[PDB]
């Protein structure tokens, strides 16, 4: 099921650069034994949310050996017995032995091949261990949020450790971090606020219970069996005749919120795509260096 | 492993109808190598919410061959992720190449290969793409929340769905979450100078109805606002929850569609290759 990519001959020098990316991943469109390089290309300055949503409607595939004529890829989704394969780690920090990798767009400052001879760009997504990625996304979003309200712009604690070494989390203005991430932070903060508002509208007296004996008791009763303190959700007031300009049906809003939250949760990765099973090598692979992996 | 489903003697009036069910999925309860047909069988349609809650407690199985004595099957996911098989679509929306599929109980009933000789009936679940199965679950659970082409709920299990939902929502409220809750007007004002910023906010947003009706004061500084920071923790918790909110109400996507040669979009009622996840 190995696909090859026609390569419109570029030049000397640049082809060496293309040879250097012998380990990254590329997102094909359909499983055909042929494809043109013009197809697997994305404007390397792009919106992170839309790219992360598009990563689902494609197939991952790693670039094996390349030649001036063509380059060979191997998809990861379909496969037989999950054969081994090599992978070039390209995240900001290393990844250990025996964990799961995830594919996220270049959330921080971006790197992108600029094949000036062929006049097209390429984006190669980062390769992160699972938990560290799920936390780095929250890190960047929370920094943007703290900036949003114009409060204290720095706290000296936007740092992430990984195997001892301290990482700095580069400043959030380098390529377009003030523009290619706005979409993500907006679409997340908004949904969070909406969920909170809907809940509080369904249970108006939640935040007026005992500071330590009422709220905990309500939560423990709700987690346990059917008491539910009656209709813990008080009957909301009756709506308007749906042409009055101020109609508000709470339940349809809850419906829309459920749908949007599910969709946003699915377009975030965090479902492992591979697992490092390195063997006969240094147990900890630094960034930029290849690492044996078996697809999940 | 190949689950073997045995068949009783059948009249030719329904054996030939069972032959046509070569690419649909059934739900066993235990994964023994052998199992009789009578075992794997669900009652006639009722309480799509209860049924959707039942698919979680059993692992699926798709059938491949139907002989005059024996009817094979394949346990969908227990140890494999690349056993490329074929299953036919039976949902209204045509599923295209690329996307995953999720099993959903049927609507309106009427899909029952009622076998008279054996005195039983089967209800094979329909197959929908993820994007629409999420929305269907949303609609049904919201309708269940309303009661404190469409069947009515039962008030005995709808409370369980409401309980799951309200728990997953309650645990979003954090002393960091209020900090985010404080910038609703600062968000609305941002959703005015630009176009995309306004685009991300919905129309019946259920928050614009609030930011223009209630003022909230500056948030109280939490205990030890120097050592730790709360917004980060609340956001990480919300990611962890929302990544698993869709499945907890419906069902995880069970397989993604891959086709090597045929036309991309496959219409209803036609078999299409697949790989499971």
């Amino acid at each position: 099921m190995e696909v090859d990519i026609a390569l419109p001959t570029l030049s000397p020098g640049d082809l060496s650069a293309l040879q250097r990316c012998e380990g990254r991943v590329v997102f094909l469109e359909t499983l055909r034994r042929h494809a043109t390089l013009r197809e697997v290309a994305l404007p390397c300055g792009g919106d992170v949310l839309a790219a992360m949503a598009a990563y689902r409607r494609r197939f991952a595939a790693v670039i094996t050996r390349v030649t001036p004529h063509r380059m060979l890829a191997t998809p990861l989704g379909v496969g037989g017995r999950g054969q081994s394969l090599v992978l070039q780690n390209t995240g900001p920090f290393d990844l250990t032995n025996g964990d799961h990798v995830c594919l996220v767009p270049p959330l921080l400052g971006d790197e992108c091949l600029r094949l000036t001879s062929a006049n097209l760009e390429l984006r190669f997504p980062m390769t992160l261990p699972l938990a560290q990625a799920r936390e780095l996304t929250a890190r960047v979003v929370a920094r943007a949020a703290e900036t949003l309200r114009g409060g204290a712009p720095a706290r000296g604690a936007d740092v992430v450790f990984s195997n001892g070494r301290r990482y700095q989390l580069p400043p959030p203005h380098r390529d377009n971090a003030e523009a290619a991430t706005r979409s993500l932070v907006l679409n997340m903060i908004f949904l969070l606020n909406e969920g909170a508002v809907i809940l509080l509208s369904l249970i108006p007296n939640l935040l007026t219970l005992g500071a330590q004996d009422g709220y905990a008791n309500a939560v423990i009763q709700l987690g346990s069996a059917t008491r539910e303190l009656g209709q813990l959700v008080r009957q909301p007031p009756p709506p308007l005749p749906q042409d009055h300009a101020r109609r508000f049906c709470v339940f349809e809003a809850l419906e829309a919120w459920i749908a949007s939250a599910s969709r946003l949760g699915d377009t975030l990765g965090t479902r492992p795509v591979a697992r490092v099973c390195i063997f006969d090598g240094p147990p900890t692979v630094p960034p930029g260096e290849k690492a044996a992996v078996v697809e999940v | 492993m190949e689950v073997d489903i045995a068949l009783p003697t059948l009249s030719p009036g329904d054996l030939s109808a069972l032959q046509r069910c070569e690419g649909r999925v059934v739900f066993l309860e235990t994964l023994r190598r052998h199992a009789t047909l009578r075992e794997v069988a669900l009652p006639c349609g009722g309480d799509v919410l209860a049924a959707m809650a039942a698919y979680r407690r059993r692992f699926a199985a798709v059938i491949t061959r139907v002989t005059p004595h024996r009817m094979l099957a394949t346990p969908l996911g227990v140890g494999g992720r690349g056993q490329s098989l074929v299953l036919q679509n039976t949902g209204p929306f045509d599923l295209t190449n690329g996307d995953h599929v999720c099993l959903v109980p049927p609507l309106l009933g009427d899909e029952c290969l009622r076998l008279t000789s054996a005195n039983l009936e089967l209800r094979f679940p329909m197959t929908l793409p993820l994007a629409q199965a999420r929305e269907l679950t949303a609609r049904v659970v919201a309708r269940a929340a309303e009661t404190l082409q469409l069947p009515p709920p039962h008030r005995d299990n709808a409370e369980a769905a409401t309980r799951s939902l309200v728990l997953n929502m309650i645990f979003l409220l954090n002393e960091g979450a209020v900090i985010l809750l404080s910038l609703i007007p600062n968000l609305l004002t941002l959703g005015a100078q630009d176009g995309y910023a306004n685009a991300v906010i919905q129309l019946g947003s259920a928050t614009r109805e609030l930011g223009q009706l209630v003022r909230q004061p500056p948030p109280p500084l939490p205990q030890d606002h120097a050592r730790r920071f709360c917004v980060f923790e609340a956001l990480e918790a919300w990611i962890a929850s929302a990544s698993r909110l869709g499945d907890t109400l419906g069902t995880r996507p069970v397989a993604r569609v891959c086709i090597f040669d045929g036309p991309p979009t496959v219409p209803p009622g036609e078999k299409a290759a697949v790989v499971e996840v």
Binding site: - | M1, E2, R33, H69
Partner: protein, 49 residues
Amino acid sequence: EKASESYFMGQMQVARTESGGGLHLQLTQPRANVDLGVGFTAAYAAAAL
């Protein structure tokens, strides 16, 4: 009695499915039977208890 059942046997059918290093064979043979007597051709008696 002398002939109460017509009884047919098929052919032994194996399924040599490999499973976890060692083969795990699975034997199977289908067989069919039918009565051929008008009127009953059997009766038990329930002697002891």
